[PDB]
Amino acid sequence: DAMDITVSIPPQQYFLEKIGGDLVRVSVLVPGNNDPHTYEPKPQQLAALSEAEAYVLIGLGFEQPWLEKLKAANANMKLIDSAQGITPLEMEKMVADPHIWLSPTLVKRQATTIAKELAELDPDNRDQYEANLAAFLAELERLNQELGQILQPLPQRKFIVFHPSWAYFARDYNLVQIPIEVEGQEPSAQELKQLIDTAKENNLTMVFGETQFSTKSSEAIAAEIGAGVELLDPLAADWSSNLKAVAQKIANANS
Numbered sequence: 001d002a003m004d005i006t007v008s009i010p011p012q013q014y015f016l017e018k019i020g021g022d023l024v025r026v027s028v029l030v031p032g033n034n035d036p037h038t039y040e041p042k043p044q045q046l047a048a049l050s051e052a053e054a055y056v057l058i059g060l061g062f063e064q065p066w067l068e069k070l071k072a073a074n075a076n077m078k079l080i081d082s083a084q085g086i087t088p089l090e091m092e093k094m095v096a097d098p099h100i101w102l103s104p105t106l107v108k109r110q111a112t113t114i115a116k117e118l119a120e121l122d123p124d125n126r127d128q129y130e131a132n133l134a135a136f137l138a139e140l141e142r143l144n145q146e147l148g149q150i151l152q153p154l155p156q157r158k159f160i161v162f163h164p165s166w167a168y169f170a171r172d173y174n175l176v177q178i179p180i181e182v183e184g185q186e187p188s189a190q191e192l193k194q195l196i197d198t199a200k201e202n203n204l205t206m207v208f209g210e211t212q213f214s215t216k217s218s219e220a221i222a223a224e225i226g227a228g229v230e231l232l233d234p235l236a237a238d239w240s241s242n243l244k245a246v247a248q249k250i251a252n253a254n255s
């Protein structure tokens with residue numbers, strides 16, 4: 001009975017569960033502990049794709065590397081581009097920043113696009129997808145207000161992270177994300193120092209790393225500038241509670 005849908009990353013399963021509930025059965029391509037930017041789908045996964053009725057793309061080029069392989073594995077599945085209508089930020093002007101799933105504001109748009117496409121695929125349950133969408137959009141506004149309350153009073157708006165997956169989140173809440181990685185690469189020995197000074201000159205209290213990437217340089221920086229080390233997980237499946245934990249971590253660090 002349920003529609004088989006595959007999504008790219010764990011957070012999307014959260015969005016799909018909220019929008020589809022029991023009407024969909026979700027599979028996920030990228031493991032929560034892998035760097036999605038260098039992930040290559042496994043043969044057993046491409047085979048399983050033949051069962052899929054639809055595939056939900058983050059879009060903005062996020063899936064560019066696997067796109068041809070997904071289409072060849074299943075030519076009948078609908079590709080849902082969840083980034084439709086969204087104006088992206090650029091990562092050094094080469095391309096769009098694809099981390100739109102960490103902005104509650106932009107997720108409202110992704111959710112609307114997804115529900116609209118699912119209702120086209122499964123017209124008989126259109127009313128349920130619409131009601132489920134409405135429930136999820138209201139939850140998103142409430143989450144947005146909650147995150148804004150946690151972050152608006154910070155005098156320190158800057159935070160250092162290893163991998164820059166938080167540019168949209170940061171724009172939403174007026175934070176400044178200072179990344180350690182450069183062009184998907186570990187910092188130079190010089191850059192590391194420069195980054196260390198930057199961090200010293202701003203009195204930063206904590207350095208964040210991400211589970212999917214080595215925290216080696218975040219740890220070295222923290223040891224050198226007198227800070228602690230915390231993990232932020234941009235791929236957490238428990239999306240809403242993870243975002244609140246992220247905001248609290250940032251608030252605790254600038255406090």
Ligand SMILES: [Zn+2]
Pocket residue numbers: 037099163164165
């Ligand atoms: Zn990323």
